[PDB]
Design a protein around this ligand. Sequence first.
Ligand SMILES: *Cc1c(COP(=O)(O)O)cnc(C)c1O
Lengths: 60, 828, 60
Amino acid sequence: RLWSAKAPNDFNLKDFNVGGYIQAVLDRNLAENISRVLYPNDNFFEGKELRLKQEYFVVA
Amino acid sequence: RKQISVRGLAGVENVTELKKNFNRHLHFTLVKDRNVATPRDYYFALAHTVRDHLVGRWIRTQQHYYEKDPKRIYYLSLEFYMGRTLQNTMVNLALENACDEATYQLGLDMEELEEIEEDAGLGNGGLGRLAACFLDSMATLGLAAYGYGIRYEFGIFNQKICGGWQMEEADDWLRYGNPWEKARPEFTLPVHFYGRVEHTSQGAKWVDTQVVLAMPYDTPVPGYRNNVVNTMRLWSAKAPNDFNLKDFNVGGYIQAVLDRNLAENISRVLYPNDNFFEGKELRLKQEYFVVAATLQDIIRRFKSSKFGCRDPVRTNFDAFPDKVAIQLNDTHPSLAIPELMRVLVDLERLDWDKAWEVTVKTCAYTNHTVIPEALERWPVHLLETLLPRHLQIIYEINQRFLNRVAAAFPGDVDRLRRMSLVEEGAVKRINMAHLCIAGSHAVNGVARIHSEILKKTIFKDFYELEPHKFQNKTNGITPRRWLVLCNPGLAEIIAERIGEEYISDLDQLRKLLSYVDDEAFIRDVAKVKQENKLKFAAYLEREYKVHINPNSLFDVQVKRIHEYKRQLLNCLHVITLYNRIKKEPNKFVVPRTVMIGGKAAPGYHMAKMIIKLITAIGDVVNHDPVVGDRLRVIFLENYRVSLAEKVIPAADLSEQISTAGTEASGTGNMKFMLNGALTIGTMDGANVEMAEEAGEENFFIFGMRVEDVDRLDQRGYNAQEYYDRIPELRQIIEQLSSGFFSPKQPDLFKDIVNMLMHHDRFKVFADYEEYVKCQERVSALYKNPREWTRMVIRNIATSGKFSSDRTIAQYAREIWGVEPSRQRLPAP
Amino acid sequence: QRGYNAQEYYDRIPELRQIIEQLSSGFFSPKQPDLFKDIVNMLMHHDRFKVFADYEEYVK
Ligand SMILES: *Cc1c(COP(=O)(O)O)cnc(C)c1O
C-alpha cells in the first residue's frame, strides 16, 4: 500500500483566505510534489525540507 | 488476430449471467468483498455490470461507422448537463427488469443503489440540458453524432441553504471515479496559447507559445433500443510535466508553478456565462481549448476513417462539408470558425478563398439570446496577446465581409459600421456574434417568436443581405428521460392504452386526446399524480424535511434565480394568500404547497437576497398556527437534473412567469407539460407554441404582452401608481419593509423593497393583479378533479411538437444534411 | 412619494424631445451613433438624480 499526496481542492473559497490571496497556489504544488520525485539519501543537495516532508508523510 | 473478438462476450441477458457478471466486478474490478462493501461499492459494481453490455455496442457502432463512413455531426459545447446514467442506461438497452431481478435475488435494492450515483457534475442549466437531450435524440435517430466539451473536475457549485442564506459548497463529483468514462491518455493534444506571428515566405507561423495538454475523456451515449451508442469526447487540461529544467530556464525562478495551475484550472471550474466577474482571460482561455483540441481531433478523423482513400482531390476539404458538420451552441465555440481557417490556410495550405467555402459550409450557429447586450464580445487587446494569429484572421474576415456587404449595398457606409466584426468605441472589441453568422451558412434561433426577433431587429442587416441563412428549430425534450424513466407510472398507462410507440416519436401521444372522457383513464391519470406527489411528500421529510400535505395543489417554480424570471411576483402572491388565510381564517382556500427551486449565481446580490426572502417567508407561514396545511412555502435545495427528475413528475401547477418577451424558449416548460401539470405563464418563450398546440383554453396565460410591455415603457413604468391602486400590494410591501418577515433584522429586506418600488427593471408590480387573478382561476378549477385531469389530458396528448427527436430531425434534415434513420442495428 | 416619471417632461418640452433626440439619433457622434444610448436610457428611464425635472427652471 503506497501513498500519493493530494491537496484539498477547496482553494477558491475554503477557510475564507482567498479571492484576496493565493500564496496557496503553492500548497497544492509543494504537496503534489511530495510524491512526484524520489530524493535518494547519502547525497542529495542539502538536507531539504521536502525530504522531511516525504518521510513524515509516509509515516503519518 | 481474428480470434481477438468481441463476438463472444456476455451471455443471454440472463439475471443468471447478470448476477454472475455483477460478482466479478465487485471482487475483481473493485477488489472488494461482501463483508467490506459499501452501498457505494455495490453501486459501482452494478454500474460496471450494465457497462460491459453498454460498451460492446459502442465498439460495434463506431467500427460500423468506420466501414459505412457517414458524415459526422459534432455537437460542440462548453456544458453537457448530463444528469445520472445508471437507470437511463438500463432502460435504453432493455436491462431494467433483468438488472432489477438480478440485484433483488442478490439481496440488494436497485432504486436504492441508483440513488448513490451523483449527477455528472458537467453542465449548469439550459444550454447544456438541451445538449444532453439533443445527444440522446441524435443517438435514437440513428445520426452519426459526437458530443465535444470540457470535462469539469468540479462542475458548477452546490447549493446548501444555511441560515436561510444560500451557500455554495464545491462539487468534487470526481471523488470516487465516474464509472461511465474511459480516460483516453493515448489521444492527447497540445493547445497553443500566447506566442508570436512571424511571416515565413511560404506562410505565417505561430511561434513561441505556452502549450497546455488536452487529454480526452470518452463517455458512451446509447439510444432507445436501437443499438447505436455514440461518443462524448470531453477534454481536461494538463500542463507539460518537466518542471525542474526543461527549456534550460530553471534552477532560478519558479514562476512555472503557474502554468501547472493556470492550465490545470482551465478544466477545473465552470465560469457560466452572462455573468461571471469580469470577462476574464480564463474564459477565453477555455473557449479556445475545447475548440482547438477538437478541430484537431476532427481533421485527424477526417484524414483516417478510410480517408486517404475518399480523397479524390488531395484529401480535399471539397468533401469536408460532405463528411463533417459543426454545430456551434451559442457564441462559445466562436473561435472554431477562425481556428478552422488557421488550421487550413497555414498548416495544410489551401488558398484563403478555398479554405473559406469549406469553413462557412461546415458550420452552423444556434442562437439563444433575445436581449442583445447579452451577446459575446472579447476586447481586441485580449485577443492580441492570447490568440494573436486568430485576431490576424478575424480581421481579414472582417475586411472581406464588409466588402461583400458593400458588394451588395453601395453608398452605405453606416451599415458597415454595424455589420463589422469590430465594435469601436470605449475600448475596441470583436463582437463574436457577427463572426459566427459570417462564418456560417445556417443561423437558427430556438422558438418561432424568437427566431423571428433575431431576423427582424438584433441580426436585422444580416437578414437583409442574406436571407438563406437564418433558420429556426424551436427547442425540445427527450421522452426517454423525461417520461419513461422519471414517470414510469405515467409512461405505463399511456402505453396501457396506446402501446409503447410514442417513446420513439411523440406525435402518437395525440391519440391520447380521444380518451378525454373514458372515466377510467381519468381516474388513472390522477391515481398516478397522487402516487408521484406522495413519493415527493415522503422524500421531502426523509431526506431533508417539512409536513407536506399530499392533497395540496403542488405549486412549483424551478428557475435560475434571476430578477427577470420573477420569483418575486411568486413571492408576493404567497404573502398575499397568507394574508387572506390570516385575515378571515374560516374560509375555503384550496391548500397549496409552493416550492421554489434554483441556484442563485455567486456575486449576484439580488439573486441571493431573494433566496433569503423565500426562506424567511417559509419560517413565518410554515410555523404560524392559524394557517395549518393551508400553505407551506418550501425552498428547494440544490436543484439539479436528478431532483427535477424527482419534482416535475409530482408537480400540479408550474410557474412559467418571466416578463413577456425575455425568454427564447424554456425546456422545463416542456417537462412539466408532458408530465401532467397545468402551466401558469406570461405569453413568451415557448409558452406561445405550447399554447398553440394545446389550445389557449387549456393554458393559464396572463399579464402584459410584448406590445404593452413596450407601451408601458413609452409612458414610463412607475411601480408606485400600481401600488397606489391595489391595497393588498401596499399590505404586503409594507410587511417586507416593516420587518414583518425578518423579526430580528427590521431594515433587512429593504434591499428588495426599494428595488421593487423605484428601480424595478422588470415590472413585477404591473403584473401583480392579473397574476393573482389567473391563480384564483387555477385554485378554482383544482376544486374540480374530473376537469383538472380532463385539462391535463388535453395538455399532455398535445406534447409531440416538443420531443427533441422532432427538433433534432429538423436539424438533421434541414442543416446537418442527413436523414435521421431509426433502424435497429444489430449486436452482440 | 410621486414616482419621478421622466418621460413626462419629455413630452411637454419640444427642445428636450429634440435634444434626447439628436443624442441617440446619432447627431453628436456619426462614427458611433448608438453611443450615448446609455446616457439616453439613464435620463429617460432610470435617472436617480432627476435631470429632466430640473431642466426648464434651469434653462430659464
Ligand atoms: C431541464 C432542466 C433545466 C431547464 O430549465 P428551464 O426552465 O428550461 O430554464 C435546467 N435545470 C434542470 C435541473 C433541468 O432539469
